[PDB]
Structures are given as structure tokens and as C-alpha cells.
Design a binder for this molecule. Sequence first.
Ligand code: ZN
Ligand code: ZN
Ligand code: ZN
Length: 178
Amino acid sequence: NSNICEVCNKWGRLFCCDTCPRSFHEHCHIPSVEANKNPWSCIFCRIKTIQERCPESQSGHQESEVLMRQMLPEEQLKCEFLLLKVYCDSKSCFFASEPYYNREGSQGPQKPMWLNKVKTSLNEQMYTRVEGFVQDMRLIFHNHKEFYREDKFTRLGIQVQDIFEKNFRNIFAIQETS
Ligand SMILES: [Zn+2]
Ligand SMILES: [Zn+2]
Ligand SMILES: [Zn+2]
């Protein structure tokens, strides 16, 4: 197994996947690494199993259809993984914890949002459809773009949103377009 966490790339107290060589800190994995379970399979392995059980699940989908799906266990897992993929980028640090807004010439967003809040919301089963999760994720980056205006720091929101969107299209097998 790897000797660094797959998400944050640091050593420490790591839990090892039994079906692939990845390792995780307890709260870097999403959901948090389960207390018992021997063997244990990580979220990458669990997602791969879904695809293998239903190969047709990789055929192209319309985003509008994906968004209306109810958060049954498999869609719950896919949103967990998609959230994890964003945390995997080091630039996610900027969006992880609760922000505050005091910048000359800007006003804070009406509805602040951050990754740890989405994490908690997923954990607490607060989203009933995939749309709920996706809206909060996109809101993170849209709030950032709006607040930081022409400051070059706005690019961080663009960059992390692109990681989100690419992973969204992969995980939920959105039909490829030009
Ligand atoms: Zn970690
Ligand atoms: Zn694994
Ligand atoms: Zn099938």
C-alpha cells in the first residue's frame, strides 16, 4: 500500500485499502474510514465496482437527468467521491472552511458555501437529489468569482471549479460534447 494519504499526500495515521494500494487519513476519506470492516474497500474501489456491475452505467447521460436523480445509495456514493476528488487538489484549501468577506469595493455573497459544509450536509443526508449537492458545489466557486471581481485571485475559483466539473462529467458519465 501507499505510504501517503491519497487525498492530502501526507503521511500520518493511514488506513489501507484491502482491494487497491491507496491509503487514507481517517477524515480525508469520504465517508470517514469505517470503524471495523475487514476487509475494507475505499471509495475508489466501491465506485469501480458500481461500474463493473453495470457497464451500461458508463454510457453518456444528459446532465439534466443526472441532476434530478434521487440520492439513493449509489448517487450518494458518487457525490461523496466527487467531493473527495475536489479535496484531492491542494487548491481546495481555499474553499474548505467557512469564509469571511471584508474587501473594499465588494460585498459578501448572500449564501456562503464551503467544502466542509457540503461534507457535513452529505454526511447528514440533507440532499434529496443530486441537484442539491451540485448546486452547493457550483455556488462555492460562483461566490468566489463574484467577490474577488478583477483580482487575479478569482482564478483559484476557476481552477477548482474545472476540477469539479471534469470529475462530475467522469463520475456521472455525462455525454461528451463539443
Ligand atoms: Zn489525508
Ligand atoms: Zn481501494
Ligand atoms: Zn447492468
